[PDB]
Structure formats: C-alpha cells, structure tokens
Design a binder for this molecule. Structure first.
Ligand SMILES: CC(=O)CCCCC/C=C/C(=O)O
Ligand SMILES: CC(=O)CCCCC/C=C/C(=O)O
Ligand SMILES: CC(=O)CCCCC/C=C/C(=O)O
Ligand SMILES: [Cl-]
Ligand SMILES: [Cl-]
Ligand SMILES: [Cl-]
Ligand SMILES: [Cl-]
Ligand SMILES: [Mg+2]
Lengths: 116, 118
C-alpha cells in the first residue's frame, strides 16, 4: 500500500529549465520579485518555462488563448489590454523576446507581478 | 517610470485559493488531493478540475489537452505518461467533475506510484 510519489510539476519544470540554461536559484528569486535583467542565463529560463506551459512556441510567439487561460475570469479584460500593448513579442532571439515581454508586462501593470 | 516593488502573486497559490473557495473544499481535502487520496464528491473533484483548467490542461467541457499536459511532466515520466494517457483519455463520466474523478482513478490504477500536484 505504498503511497504514490508526488511530483510537483511546477518545481520539475523550473528545475529542468534552470539546468538547461545554467540558471541559479538567486536569479529565479530576482524574477519572482519583479526584478528583470537582459541576461540570457535568466531570460532563456523564462522562455523555457513559458514554452513548457505551452504559453509560447519555439519562436517565442505567445499563444494568447493559453496565456489568458492562466488568469481568473475577473482579470481577463485587464490582461487582454496588457496583451494589446505587449504582443506580438519582439527581440533578437527567444530569450530577448521574453525579456522584452516581461518588461512590457511589468511596466503595463506595475502594481502586480504574476509568477508561475 | 522608476521601478516600484509590485505585489507578487504566485499563480499556483492563487489558483488553489480561488478553486478552494469556489468549490467548498476544506484544507483537509486539499491535503488529501495533494497526497492522491480521492473521493467522488464535487468539493474534491470540481476542485481538481478547477486546478487543471487554470493551466489549460482541460477546457470547460471536460476535454483534456494531452499535449499541454506532456510539456509539464518531467523527462523521467514522459514515456509512462504517454502510455497512461493513451489508456485513460479521452475522459468519460457523468458530468464535468466526475470525468476528472474517473481520469484520476484511471491514472492511479495504471501508475499506482505516481501522483502530482500542480
Ligand atoms: C505568469 C504569466 O506570464 C502571466 C502573464 C499575464 C499577466 C498580464 C496581467 C496583467 C494584470 O492582470 O494586470
Ligand atoms: C508573460 C511574462 O510575464 C513574462 C514571463 C514571466 C516569467 C514568469 C515566471 C514564472 C515563475 O516564476 O515560475
Ligand atoms: C493524464 C494525466 O497524466 C494526469 C491527469 C490526472 C490529474 C488529476 C488532477 C490533479 C491535480 O489537480 O492536481
Ligand atoms: Cl507574440
Ligand atoms: Cl462544486
Ligand atoms: Cl479528454
Ligand atoms: Cl455533462
Ligand atoms: Mg479558461
């Protein structure tokens, strides 16, 4: 009757993305506080994490329906407005695209910061 | 503008709180769900539904998106998850929440040693 091993999917996904990009816990902790920097070790992590959740494709194009689907009904119109300002993504590579997206979302809704 | 510190919201934590409130789920029940101990009662099963739907793993008609789910699962479970979803999807049951109950039970029967929390 052994209880199942319980896998924390978010933790697994972060762990995999960090290992793939040489990302430190300190860097993840920065992003989770809303502190953004254009450094591939952390911005490629952000890209990786979004891609794992099907929020972006392999050119860091946002799937708006999936991204909006993260949020409660009450936040939809606010979120749609942010996406109107911040999409489509742009930047020099997938990591920079997500840096620029994160910065746009931060600046567009400066009093809140949502993290997976 | 200058940077100002935002109020930070953890989606998983906020989803659990919202889902608990919207389905009458007790904290003891949340703990049970986290450990994989289920019952076919909506305060458990609609809560589980609610958590899946918040990451687009299910839509509002009990259709599970297998491709979205596979991206979330760790490398070490990919092969097993493919097989388990092959067996257990698409969903079936008497209503939206009961479909998710049956899916959970199918997963537990197929892979007794594997459970997850979002
Ligand atoms: C974790 C994540 O990327 C979700 C991004 C959506 C944020 C847009 C919402 C802004 C607001 O509600 O003010
Ligand atoms: C859409 C957007 O806000 C840019 C990406 C933000 C990174 C999300 C952080 C997730 C986590 O903390 O797990
Ligand atoms: C198809 C598959 O591998 C998992 C589906 C069952 C998960 C039940 C819900 C769990 C949760 O909400 O934490
Ligand atoms: Cl885009
Ligand atoms: Cl309910
Ligand atoms: Cl299905
Ligand atoms: Cl039905
Ligand atoms: Mg939705």
């Amino acid at each position: 009757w052994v209880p199942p091993e319980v896998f924390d999917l978010v933790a697994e996904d972060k762990a995999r993305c960090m290992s793939e990009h040489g990302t430190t816990q300190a860097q993840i902790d920065d992003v989770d506080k809303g502190n953004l920097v254009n450094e591939p070790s952390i911005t490629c992590y952000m890209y990786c994490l979004l891609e794992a959740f099907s929020l972006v494709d392999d050119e860091a194009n946002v799937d708006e329906d999936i991204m909006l689907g993260l949020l409660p009904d009450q936040l939809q119109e606010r979120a749609q407005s942010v996406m109107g300002k911040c999409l489509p993504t742009s930047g020099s590579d997938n990591c920079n695209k997500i840096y620029n997206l994160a910065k746009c979302v931060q600046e567009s809704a400066p009093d809140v910061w949502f993290v997976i």
